[PDB]
Amino acid sequence: SHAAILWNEAKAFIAECYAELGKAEEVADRLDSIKSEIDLTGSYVHTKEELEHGAKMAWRNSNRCIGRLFWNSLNVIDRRDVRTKEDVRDALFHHIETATNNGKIRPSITIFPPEEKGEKQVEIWNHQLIRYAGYEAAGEAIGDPASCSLTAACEQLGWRGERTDFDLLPLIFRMKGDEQPVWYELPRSLVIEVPITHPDIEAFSDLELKWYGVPIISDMKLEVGGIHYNAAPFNGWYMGTEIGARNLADEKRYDKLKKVASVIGISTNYNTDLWKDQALVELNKAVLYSYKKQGVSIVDHHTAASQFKRFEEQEEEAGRKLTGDWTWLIPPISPAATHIFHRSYDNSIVKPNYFYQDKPYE
Amino acid sequence: SHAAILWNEAKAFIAECYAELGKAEEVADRLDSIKSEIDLTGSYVHTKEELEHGAKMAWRNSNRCIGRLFWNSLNVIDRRDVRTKEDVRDALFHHIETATNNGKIRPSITIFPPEEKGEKQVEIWNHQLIRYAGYEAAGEAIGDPASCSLTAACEQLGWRGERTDFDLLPLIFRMKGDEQPVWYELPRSLVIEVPITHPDIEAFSDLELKWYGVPIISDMKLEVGGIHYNAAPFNGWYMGTEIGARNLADEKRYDKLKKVASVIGISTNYNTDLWKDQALVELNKAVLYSYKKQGVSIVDHHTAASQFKRFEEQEEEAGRKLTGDWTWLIPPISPAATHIFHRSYDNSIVKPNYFYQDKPYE
Numbered sequence: 001s002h003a004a005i006l007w008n009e010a011k012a013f014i015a016e017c018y019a020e021l022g023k024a025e026e027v028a029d030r031l032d033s034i035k036s037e038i039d040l041t042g043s044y045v046h047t048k049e050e051l052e053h054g055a056k057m058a059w060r061n062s063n064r065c066i067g068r069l070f071w072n073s074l075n076v077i078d079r080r081d082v083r084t085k086e087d088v089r090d091a092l093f094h095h096i097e098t099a100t101n102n103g104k105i106r107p108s109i110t111i112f113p114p115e116e117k118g119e120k121q122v123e124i125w126n127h128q129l130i131r132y133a134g135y136e137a138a139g140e141a142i143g144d145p146a147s148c149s150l151t152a153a154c155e156q157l158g159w160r161g162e163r164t165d166f167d168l169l170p171l172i173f174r175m176k177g178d179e180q181p182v183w184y185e186l187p188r189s190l191v192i193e194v195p196i197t198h199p200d201i202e203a204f205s206d207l208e209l210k211w212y213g214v215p216i217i218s219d220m221k222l223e224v225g226g227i228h229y230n231a232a233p234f235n236g237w238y239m240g241t242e243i244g245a246r247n248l249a250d251e252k253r254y255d256k257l258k259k260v261a262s263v264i265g266i267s268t269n270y271n272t273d274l275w276k277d278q279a280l281v282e283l284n285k286a287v288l289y290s291y292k293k294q295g296v297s298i299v300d301h302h303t304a305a306s307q308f309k310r311f312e313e314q315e316e317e318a319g320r321k322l323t324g325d326w327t328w329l330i331p332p333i334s335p336a337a338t339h340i341f342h343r344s345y346d347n348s349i350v351k352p353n354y355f356y357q358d359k360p361y362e
Numbered sequence: 363s364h365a366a367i368l369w370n371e372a373k374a375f376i377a378e379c380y381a382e383l384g385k386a387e388e389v390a391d392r393l394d395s396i397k398s399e400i401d402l403t404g405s406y407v408h409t410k411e412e413l414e415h416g417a418k419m420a421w422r423n424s425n426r427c428i429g430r431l432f433w434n435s436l437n438v439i440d441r442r443d444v445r446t447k448e449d450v451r452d453a454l455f456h457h458i459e460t461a462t463n464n465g466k467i468r469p470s471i472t473i474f475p476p477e478e479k480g481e482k483q484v485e486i487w488n489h490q491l492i493r494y495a496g497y498e499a500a501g502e503a504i505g506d507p508a509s510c511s512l513t514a515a516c517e518q519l520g521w522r523g524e525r526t527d528f529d530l531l532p533l534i535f536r537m538k539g540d541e542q543p544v545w546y547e548l549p550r551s552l553v554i555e556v557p558i559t560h561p562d563i564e565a566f567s568d569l570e571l572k573w574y575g576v577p578i579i580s581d582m583k584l585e586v587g588g589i590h591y592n593a594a595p596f597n598g599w600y601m602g603t604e605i606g607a608r609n610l611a612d613e614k615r616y617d618k619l620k621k622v623a624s625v626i627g628i629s630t631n632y633n634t635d636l637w638k639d640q641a642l643v644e645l646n647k648a649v650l651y652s653y654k655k656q657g658v659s660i661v662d663h664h665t666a667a668s669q670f671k672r673f674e675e676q677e678e679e680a681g682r683k684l685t686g687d688w689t690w691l692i693p694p695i696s697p698a699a700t701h702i703f704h705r706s707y708d709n710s711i712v713k714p715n716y717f718y719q720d721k722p723y724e
């Protein structure tokens with residue numbers, strides 16, 4: 001069944017949604033109208049309000065997210081009107097632009113058309129609109145290993161990277177009707193990057209490290225009232241450790257710890273020296289310092305956790321049960337220094353929410 | 363039922379145990395003998411071999427433990443012969459002694475008599491044989507907050523601390539038949555302590571930090587073949603972060619981070635400086651350095667995780683399924699630098715094992 005599943009979800013969503021918006025009386029007629037539409041067309045269409053809030057509710061229900069305090073300030077851009085590839089390209093460009101906001105990043109989400117009878121109207125391949133390529137010749141590795149398969153997929157369609165450690169992959173999506181996707185390179189004037197330097201250590205720039213300024217997840221599905229928005233790229237700002245303790249530090253990512261240990265002048269001879277731990281704190285300090293120097297929003301794990309704590313409180317004050325995933329909520333650097341580590345969370349899925357979906361490539 | 367539960371467990375344990383020891387043929391007669399005994403006495407008695415190995419199997423099945431690589435080298439001290447309070451005192455003293463082994467700590471466990479008809483023969487109150495007291499006057503806090511309730515309990519029986527931050531609590535247990543427990547102060551010549559200093563920073567000793575040299579958990583129950591050893595204190599060596607990132611760093615424990623940040627000469631003004639993170643790495647480095655300076659065994663989280671990895675491998679080579687608890691396996695400092703962080707574990711309880719039991723005080 002599908003006509004049953006939908007109408008069920010719809011009644012639940014519209015009820016909770018209007019309850020929060022203060023339009024409990026309008027639940028009656030709206031649900032009558034949706035009933036006709038589901039039987040008439042075989043689905044329904046959300047209003048700019050239902051969807052905007054639905055996107056905000058899905059944010060608040062994101063267990064694995066430490067920054068849900070600002071759920072209610074999401075900038076929902078409604079682009080369910082797109083019909084061509086140029087329309088999609090221009091919307092992603094706009095999204096990157098307005099979201100970046102010259103450095104003062106703005107949490108935003110672009111809502112593209114949802115699936116009709118299970119068939120997607122638009123299909124975004126990218127994990128994040130802005131991301132570096134990854135290559136691994138029979139010899140060694142160049143770039144972000146995490147991007148390996150998507151990079152392969154793009155080179156299969158005519159795209160070719162210069163092969164540096166920081167090649168910006170192109171935008172890649174498929175439109176309903178097209179068998180294969182299309183790609184568009186990102187105008188470099190749209191993409192803000194940040195070179196990594198250290199406040200006290202002058203040698204740190206020899207590492208020639210840098211990272212893009214805005215993470216825009218683009219491969220997740222957004223479920224709201226039974227409607228599946230398979231394409232709805234969203235973004236918040238970065239949390240220092242995502243770049244300094246994972247992207248640049250993981251052995252399966254960039255793996256910069258030995259290098260960092262060297263430029264900061266410490267030995268990588270013994271584990272008892274805790275050099276990896278000392279290197280992580282200098283790299284993480286460098287990352288927070290650079291983004292701040294350049295005027296691009298970022299947050300350290302202490303402020304974030306502290307902000308998350310205030311969320312937990314607000315959720316109780318409003319009467320909503322709280323859900324969270326401890327294994328992803330704790331920062332990868334000094335978890336036991338934040339309150340998140342010491343308490344527990346109910347890892348229960350509540351819709352509306354964002355879900356993983358199967359990669360088209362691979 | 364209880365006679366049924368026992369015989370069930372017994373058949374399973376003896377089978378797996380002898381299989382590992384290479385005495386599969388002896389499983390027959392031994393199980394016949396245990397059958398008589400269970401119906402004759404209403405329980406059975408393990409052999410020095412069954413119990414020794416049972417204690418080692420329970421170690422290997424400890425999900426929350428990162429050091430199971432040395433499960434097979436446990437030093438099982440059989441003291442199921444104790445009958446008086448002096449017998450128990452002398453056994454705990456001996457345990458502390460032989461286990462400490464002048465600094466070259468030895469993983470050990472003292473097996474006391476198990477429960478008969480649910481009634482304990484010996485009941486140990488202490489969480490760890492060696493541990494500091496905790497006090498909180500209407501005014502401020504002195505000592506280890508974690509010890510607050512046990513300390514209260516001891517002062518209720520005549521014990522009185524000098525009230526420093528590091529008062530060694532006394533040994534406290536109850537013998538079957540006695541209504542209230544008894545206490546015995548620990549001879550200070552038995553207890554090894556380690557003052558905390560830093561390899562490069564001379565000011566670090568102004569903090570006047572120290573920690574005992576051996577953690578001996580004494581409030582856990584050991585289940586082997588249906589038999590419940592409620593009193594069986596065990597110990598391994600320390601892993602630096604247990605002292606440097608938790609005991610001395612937690613806000614509900616000692617809370618030394620602001621102080622450490624000061625002696626190392628860094629500001630505690632902004633979170634973006636990552637001072638807590640910088641302080642944790644200096645304190646953790648200091649702890650590993652001091653214990654090593656004094657010749658008391660200790661292991662850093664990198665070597666430990668690396669040692670745990672080898673365990674995972676061995677468990678697969680031997681054909682045993684592996685169980686683990688990720689939320690306790692990852693070190694509290696730089697978890698994403700160890701392989702444990704990046705994989706997952708089956709948190710399934712397999713007996714023989716160690717279990718929590720209800721505190722007599724409280």
Ligand code: HEM
Nearest residue numbers: 059062064065066067070107108234235236237238239354
């Ligand atoms: C205010 C800025 C934000 C901060 C500081 C923040 C931070 C984080 C962090 C640290 C994670 C962990 C990701 C990882 O470990 O890989 C995460 C995950 C997540 N966040 Fe947020 N976030 C922000 C905004 C948002 C927004 C705008 C949305 C959606 C409308 C959102 C949805 C999610 C979801 C669904 C995940 C799961 C990611 C996954 O499993 O792939 N977050 N976020």
Ligand code: HEM
Nearest residue numbers: 421424426427428429432469470596597598599600601716
């Ligand atoms: C080789 C030395 C050992 C090391 C390095 C080691 C390390 C650890 C660590 C780091 C934990 C975490 C404790 C916490 O986070 O509070 C732990 C837990 C545990 N270990 Fe081990 N361990 C060692 C020996 C042993 C021995 C000898 C036994 C028993 C025969 C054992 C039984 C357990 C159990 C049951 C836990 C659970 C503790 C609890 O939940 O209270 N370990 N160990």
